[PDB]
Design an enzyme around this catalytic site. Structure first.
Site, PDB file in Angstrom:
ATOM      1  CD  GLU A 191      13.595  -2.244  11.399  1.00 12.56           C
ATOM      2  OE1 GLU A 191      12.683  -3.076  11.204  1.00 12.56           O
ATOM      3  OE2 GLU A 191      13.488  -1.051  11.051  1.00 12.56           O
ATOM      4  CE  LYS A 245       7.339   5.364  14.535  1.00  7.45           C
ATOM      5  NZ  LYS A 245       7.689   5.536  13.110  1.00  7.45           N
ATOM      6  CE1 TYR A 271      -0.063   2.754   3.743  1.00  2.00           C
ATOM      7  CE2 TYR A 271       1.175   0.786   4.350  1.00  2.00           C
ATOM      8  CZ  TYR A 271       0.838   2.114   4.569  1.00  2.00           C
ATOM      9  OH  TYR A 271       1.407   2.812   5.606  1.00  2.00           O
ATOM     10  CE  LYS A 281       3.580   2.857  14.164  1.00  2.00           C
ATOM     11  NZ  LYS A 281       3.825   2.259  12.824  1.00  2.00           N
ATOM     12  CE  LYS A 285       8.153   1.598  15.172  1.00  2.10           C
ATOM     13  NZ  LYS A 285       9.025   1.963  14.009  1.00  2.10           N
ATOM     14  CE  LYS A 308       0.412   1.577   8.702  1.00  2.00           C
ATOM     15  NZ  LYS A 308       0.876   1.942  10.074  1.00  2.00           N
ATOM     16  NE  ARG A 354       4.169  -1.144   6.668  1.00  2.00           N
ATOM     17  CZ  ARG A 354       5.325  -1.568   7.177  1.00  2.00           C
ATOM     18  NH1 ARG A 354       5.436  -2.796   7.670  1.00  2.00           N
ATOM     19  NH2 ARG A 354       6.381  -0.763   7.182  1.00  2.00           N
ATOM     20  CG  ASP A 411       2.347   7.528  10.086  1.00  2.00           C
ATOM     21  OD1 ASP A 411       3.271   8.360   9.951  1.00  2.00           O
ATOM     22  OD2 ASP A 411       2.457   6.346   9.716  1.00  2.00           O
TER      23      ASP A 411
HETATM   24  N1  LIG Z   1      10.329  -4.403  17.921  1.00  2.00           N
HETATM   25  C1  LIG Z   1       9.637  -4.197  16.742  1.00  2.00           C
HETATM   26  N2  LIG Z   1       8.505  -4.895  16.479  1.00  2.00           N
HETATM   27  C2  LIG Z   1       7.803  -4.694  15.348  1.00  2.00           C
HETATM   28  N3  LIG Z   1       8.159  -3.756  14.461  1.00  2.00           N
HETATM   29  C3  LIG Z   1       9.324  -3.081  14.593  1.00  2.00           C
HETATM   30  C4  LIG Z   1      10.100  -3.253  15.777  1.00  2.00           C
HETATM   31  N4  LIG Z   1      11.160  -2.419  15.674  1.00  2.00           N
HETATM   32  C5  LIG Z   1      11.236  -1.987  14.449  1.00  2.00           C
HETATM   33  N5  LIG Z   1      10.054  -2.210  13.797  1.00  2.00           N
HETATM   34  C6  LIG Z   1       9.674  -1.632  12.494  1.00  2.00           C
HETATM   35  O1  LIG Z   1       8.487  -0.799  12.612  1.00  2.00           O
HETATM   36  C7  LIG Z   1       7.900  -0.823  11.288  1.00  2.00           C
HETATM   37  C8  LIG Z   1       6.472  -0.259  11.254  1.00  2.00           C
HETATM   38  O2  LIG Z   1       6.371   0.946  12.018  1.00  2.00           O
HETATM   39  P1  LIG Z   1       6.906   2.248  11.166  1.00  2.00           P
HETATM   40  O3  LIG Z   1       8.380   2.364  11.371  1.00  2.00           O
HETATM   41  O4  LIG Z   1       6.212   3.532  11.810  1.00  2.00           O
HETATM   42  C9  LIG Z   1       6.536   2.135   9.357  1.00  2.00           C
HETATM   43  P2  LIG Z   1       4.765   2.429   8.966  1.00  2.00           P
HETATM   44  O5  LIG Z   1       4.499   3.889   8.913  1.00  2.00           O
HETATM   45  O6  LIG Z   1       3.860   1.780  10.129  1.00  2.00           O
HETATM   46  O7  LIG Z   1       4.377   1.691   7.558  1.00  2.00           O
HETATM   47  P3  LIG Z   1       4.841   2.535   6.235  1.00  2.00           P
HETATM   48  O8  LIG Z   1       6.190   3.107   6.405  1.00  2.00           O
HETATM   49  O9  LIG Z   1       4.862   1.520   4.994  1.00  2.00           O
HETATM   50  O10 LIG Z   1       3.790   3.712   5.948  1.00  2.00           O
HETATM   51  C10 LIG Z   1       7.961  -2.297  10.876  1.00  2.00           C
HETATM   52  O11 LIG Z   1       7.870  -2.455   9.447  1.00  2.00           O
HETATM   53  C11 LIG Z   1       9.310  -2.752  11.474  1.00  2.00           C
HETATM   54  O12 LIG Z   1      10.301  -2.907  10.452  1.00  2.00           O
HETATM   55 CA   LIG Z   2      10.642   2.568  10.366  1.00  2.00          CA
HETATM   56 CL   LIG Z   3       9.847  -1.137   7.422  1.00  2.00          CL
HETATM   57 MG   LIG Z   4       4.404   6.045   8.488  1.00  2.00          MG
END
Ligand SMILES: Nc1ncnc2c1ncn2[C@@H]1O[C@H](COP(=O)(O)CP(=O)(O)OP(=O)(O)O)[C@@H](O)[C@H]1O
Ligand SMILES: [Ca+2]
Ligand SMILES: [Cl-]
Ligand SMILES: [Mg+2]
Ligand SMILES: [Cl-]
Length: 375
Positions: free
Chosen positions: A160, A243, A38, A241, A100, A76, A55, A273
């Protein structure tokens, strides 16, 4: 069932490449895979059937019929207070949190007799190939074996991928893969953190967990520096999450809430977001950001359709006739600034993706006229 999930995903891709879409890839062994991804999605879109699973899920294909789910990345998930999904959450139901990590997601899939990685939307992206290179290293042969057996058992390991050459915000010194979770392909259920922790072979790559008894970690995360934040895992297995403002202030880029061009850029970069969640306590800002998001999604749907439709329906005709049709469609929609993009589609674009990037960049130049009424 697997076929039902596939049907619902294909149903989501009917709308437009702006929202949910899929792409076909062929691996070095020649196997055909279809990835569902997406670009931009609103809360309403995420409510559609199985949209949250759109996703990165990948199916090995046999023409148009899916043979199996080859890779199952996480569903997602969002920041706390980002949208209805994460509002009114009982914070005491947080099981634990995980560091994270700040890189790029890579997910396993079995390709013949090989265990490989795929990034969000490709099996041959730069991160994917580098990830595969690491797994080949003799110093990771025990992990490779572990991942291969898991995949042959229908499980996807999600990592990651971090590296100094793959910097988002956090500065990682070495290139490596950090194990985040393991999900069952068929059901989408996760193997418990404890079960992963139990494996001494996997533990060294496992992302760090912090046990929780209170929600104090949240405000501390928001005010921290030099960390992105954490991913909370609920009692029911769901995620959300947190941040740090520090991370979001650097990831957003600049002064989004004070400059419409920068706000629109943040939205285009897919970072609004995080910004929205960051200002969840500031109702005015939170809703202002949503207004710009809505304005952008609406514009993109309209613009994308207009340009693609006009090209498709008049591509065959000569240049003058085409130009006249382009002028007609552009002018007859208050979209005069799209004439150039339409004139460029005549000799085609490397992908319905390239077209979308030109539209995004072109929008940032003509943003002034689309600022939502009232702001
Ligand atoms: N401990 C953890 N558990 C799960 N996800 C984690 C993580 N630490 C890192 N991540 C990362 O967090 C990502 C999703 O959160 P975001 O970094 O905000 C990207 P998103 O905005 O949700 O999707 P998008 O970028 O395609 O729009 C995952 O794809 C993963 O790679
Ligand atoms: Ca990221
Ligand atoms: Cl990612
Ligand atoms: Mg995003
Ligand atoms: Cl490959």
């Amino acid at each position: 069932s697997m076929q039902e999930l596939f049907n619902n995903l294909m149903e989501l891709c009917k709308d437009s490449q702006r929202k949910f879409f899929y792409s076909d890839d062929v691996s070095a062994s020649g196997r055909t895979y279809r990835i569902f991804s997406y670009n931009y999605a609103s809360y309403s879109d995420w409510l559609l059937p199985d949209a949250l699973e759109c996703r990165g899920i990948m199916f090995e294909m046999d023409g148009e019929k899916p043979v199996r789910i080859a890779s199952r990345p996480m569903e997602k998930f969002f920041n706390l207070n980002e949208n209805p999904f994460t509002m009114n959450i009982d914070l005491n139901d947080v099981d634990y949190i995980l560091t994270k990590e700040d890189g790029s997601l890579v997910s396993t899939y079995l390709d013949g007799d090989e265990i490989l990685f795929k990034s969000k939307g490709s099996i041959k992206s730069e991160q994917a190939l580098m990830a595969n290179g690491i797994l080949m290293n003799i110093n990771h042969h025990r992990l490779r074996d572990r991942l291969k057996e898991l995949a042959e058992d229908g499980f996807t390991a999600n990592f990651e991928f971090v590296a100094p050459t793959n910097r988002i915000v956090l500065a990682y010194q070495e290139m490596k893969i950090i194990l985040l979770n393991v999900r069952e392909n068929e059901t989408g259920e996760y193997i418990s953190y404890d079960d992963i922790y139990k494996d001494a072979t996997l533990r060294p790559y496992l992302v760090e967990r912090y046990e929780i008894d209170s929600p104090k970690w949240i405000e501390e995360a928001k005010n921290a520096e030099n960390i992105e934040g954490y991913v909370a895992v609920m009692k029911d297995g769901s995620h959300f999450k947190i941040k740090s403002d520090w991370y979001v202030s650097l990831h957003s880029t600049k002064s989004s809430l004070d400059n419409p061009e920068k706000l629109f850029k943040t939205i285009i970069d897919g970072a609004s977001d995080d910004l929205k969640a960051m200002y969840a306590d500031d109702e005015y800002s939170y809703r202002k950001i949503e207004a710009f998001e809505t304005t952008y999604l609406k514009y993109l749907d309209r613009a994308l359709f207009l340009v693609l439709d006009c090209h498709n329906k008049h591509c065959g005709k000569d240049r003058k006739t085409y130009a006249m049709e382009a002028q007609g469609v552009a002018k007859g929609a208050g979209m005069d600034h799209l004439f150039g993009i339409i004139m460029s589609l005549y000799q085609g674009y490397d992908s319905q993706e390239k077209v979308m990037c030109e539209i995004e960049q072109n929008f940032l130049k003509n943003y002034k006229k689309f600022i939502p009424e009232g702001y």
